[PDB]
Amino acid sequence: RHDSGYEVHHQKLVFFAEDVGSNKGAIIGLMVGGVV
Amino acid sequence: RHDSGYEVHHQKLVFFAEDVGSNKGAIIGLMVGGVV
Amino acid sequence: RHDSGYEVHHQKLVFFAEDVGSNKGAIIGLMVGGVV
Amino acid sequence: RHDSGYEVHHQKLVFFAEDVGSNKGAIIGLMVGGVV
Amino acid sequence: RHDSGYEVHHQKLVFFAEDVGSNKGAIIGLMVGGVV
């Protein structure tokens, strides 16, 4: 038996980020995996 | 038996970040894995 | 038996960061694994 | 029996950071594993 | 029996940092394993 009240089994998140363009400026409060 | 009140079994996060462009400036409050 | 109140079994985080572009300046408050 | 109130079994974090570009300046408040 | 109030079993952190680019200046408040 498991008897869980709150449960989450599997969550898969895949992020692909590629940047070829140049001359770009940014201001980010909090950046996880994105490309600037 | 497990008897858990709150539980999370598996969570997979994959981040791919590539940067080829140049001449880019940024200001980041908190950066985890992203490319600048 | 396990009898846990709060529990987290497995969490996998994968970060890939590559930087080929040049001439880039940044200011980061807190950087974990990202490339500048 | 385990009888844990708060528990975390396994958490895996993988960070890959590569930098080929040049001429880049940064200011980091706190850097863990990222490349500048 | 274990009877733990707060517990953390295993946490694995892997950091890969490589730097090929040149001419880069940085100011770091606190650096753990990152490359400058």
Helix (H) or strand (E) holding A14: strand A10-19
> Residue C11: what residue type?
Q
Residue D13 structure tokens: 């974090």
Distance of CA B18 to the CA centre of its chain: 14
Tally of CB atoms within 10 A around E5: 10
- The residues near C36 (Cβ < 8 Å, ≥ 6 apart) are B35, B36, C19, C24, C26, C28, D19, D24, D26, D28, D34, D35, D36, E26
Residue D22 structure tokens: 């040049």
Answer yes or no: are the C-beta atoms of B26 and D25 closer than 8 Å: no
Considering only CB atoms, C21 lies closest to which of A22, A31, A33, namely A22
Structure-token match 């529990």, residue found: C7
- Nearest Cα neighbor of C30 from B32, E23, B21, E1 is B32
> Residue C20: what residue type?
V
Residue of chain E nearest C22, judged by CA positions: E21
Size of interface D-E (CB pairs under 8 A): 133
Return the beta strands (E) in chain B as ranges: 10-19, 25-28
Q: Spell out the domain ranges in chain E.
A: 1-36
Decide yes or no: CATH 2.60.40.1930 for domain A1-36.
no
Residue A15 structure tokens: 């992020």
Residue of chain D nearest B5, judged by CA positions: D5
- The residues near E7 (Cβ < 8 Å, ≥ 6 apart) are D4, D6, D7, D8
> Residue D3: what residue type?
D
- Nearest Cα neighbor of E11 from D10, B23, B6, C8 is D10
Answer yes or no: are the C-beta atoms of A30 and B29 closer than 8 Å: yes
Resolution in Å equals 3.2
DSSP annotation of B34 reads -
- Nearest Cα neighbor of E1 from D7, C6, B7, D4 is D4
DSSP codes of every residue in D4-34? -SB---EEEEEEEEEE---S-EEEES-BSS-
